């Protein structure tokens, strides 16, 4: 007896009789189905007033929401999302055109204490990157790992630039559970990518370069030097030109033998810029700046010749 079953559900939720009569009045006004009234009962278990529920369901009706999103409003209620923020997430889902699994991910991010603005931003970034619901589910696992919204955004950006699968992002969330910094996760992602690509490339010189970069990254302790070296390893593994491999090898031969971070930062920057460039004149001037750096001995002259080439290439 559906109308009485809905009343019994509100009775099991412990709703006051006048407030049952109000939720029934709302059900009669809007034509609420028993599962929409069950969502009202679950918002009542979340302690929301009949008035607030009524305006919320009135808004859901004025939005023309799909019943699955309307049911998922009770999941956002169980996640403890602020009453307005529930409406915001519902509006956002409607504007985004995403599935209820994106709403379940929003509920998980709500349990992780993430604001509706950050959720909306994360979903915005996800659609703008062209990421999928499994990548969004792994992002919710980074939320379970307590990673900050900006760190997730940059991690997702890096994962997209590396062409990673969602399972890779799940492994990144496992490094998050291990308490690894977003920087060190990013390094490990760069490294794993460079290594797998260095299997796919057969070339011993690429493999030497990638090993030398992985050695330098294992020996050093600075996040810029590490990211530059491992990015250079990914770039070397993506490259096909002996001029880029020579410039990178020369830069690594200078850098791995050097004791000052300044010339390492500059030489790795020059090599990364050369590997990203498309002009033989810039490659030759960088190869020249490295030749000048091998034939000279003063670190101030090495830094200046690398600075000239970097300011030409940047």
């Amino acid at each position: 007896c559906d109308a009485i079953q809905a009343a019994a559900a509100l009775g099991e939720a412990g709703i006051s009789s006048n407030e049952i009569l109000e939720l029934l009045a709302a059900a009669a006004e809007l034509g609420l189905d028993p599962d929409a009234i069950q969502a009202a009962a679950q918002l009542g278990e979340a302690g929301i007033s009949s008035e607030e529920i009524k305006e919320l369901l009135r808004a859901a009706h004025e939005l023309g929401l799909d019943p699955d999103a309307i049911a998922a409003a009770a999941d956002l209620g169980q996640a403890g999302v602020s009453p307005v923020e529930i409406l915001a997430l519902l509006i956002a889902a409607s504007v985004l055109g995403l599935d209820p699994d994106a709403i379940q991910a929003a509920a998980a991010l709500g349990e992780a204490g993430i604001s509706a603005e950050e959720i909306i931003e994360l979903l915005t970034a996800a659609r703008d990157l062209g990421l999928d619901p499994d990548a969004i589910q792994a992002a919710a696992q980074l939320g379970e790992a307590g990673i900050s919204s900006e760190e997730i955004k940059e991690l997702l950006r890096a994962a997209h630039e590396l062409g990673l699968d969602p399972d890779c992002i799940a492994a990144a969330a496992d490094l998050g559970q291990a308490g690894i910094s977003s920087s060190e996760i990013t390094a490990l992602l760069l490294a794993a990518a460079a290594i797998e690509l260095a299997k796919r490339a057969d070339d011993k010189d690429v493999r030497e370069i990638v090993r030398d970069a992985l050695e330098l990254a294992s020996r050093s302790t600075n996040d810029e030097v590490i990211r530059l070296a491992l990015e250079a390893a990914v770039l070397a593994a993506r490259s096909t030109d002996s001029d880029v491999l020579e410039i990178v090898k020369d830069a690594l031969e200078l850098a791995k033998q050097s004791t000052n971070e300044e010339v390492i930062k500059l030489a790795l920057k020059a090599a990364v810029l050369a590997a990203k460039s498309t002009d033989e004149e810039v490659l030759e001037e960088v190869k020249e700046a490295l030749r000048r750096a091998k034939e000279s001995t003063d670190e101030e002259e090495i830094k200046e010749e690398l600075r000239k080439a970097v300011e030409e290439a940047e």
Partner: protein
Amino acid sequence: YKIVAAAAEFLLKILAEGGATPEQLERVTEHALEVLKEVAKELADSPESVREAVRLISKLTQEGLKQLKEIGAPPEQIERVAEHGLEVLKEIAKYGSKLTDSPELKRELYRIISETAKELLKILAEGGATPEQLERVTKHALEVLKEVAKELADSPESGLAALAAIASLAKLGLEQLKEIGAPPEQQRRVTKAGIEAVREIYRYGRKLY
């Protein structure tokens, strides 16, 4: 602009160190804001100039409220200058919307408006004002945010951002009202007004999507 803005802030801080009455401080603050609005309306002609204008207006506003808080003035004067600051800020945001076309700067400008609201609300709450004032200010702040959103908004993403900002302001405001122990009646009144502001924002959103 930065120089004259700094000169206004400096003069205000000097007057406050000088131990002038809350009434004199408020009068000078209004005059300073009015001048600041005028010289902003003249000198602003670029996205960064609007960003900087808002940053300085909000800065001078924050310093002004901090002076009234430190001298221990009644919340009534604080609420007046809060309204004045928001109203001026809105008029500048209005002008700045004519100068600014890039989505990033439009969004970040709105975000800074919301940060300004969040900060001035937080400052008033730290000022120990009654819920009776907190609701007036919260409502006005939401309504100013609504008017600014209605002025600026022209794509769904910016709508969602403005919505989310509004929603977060409601969340913060309700968190202050909860901390001061305001009655569930006031909590409902404010929350419903927040939902209604979001409903009006959705009535705008219906244009975009």
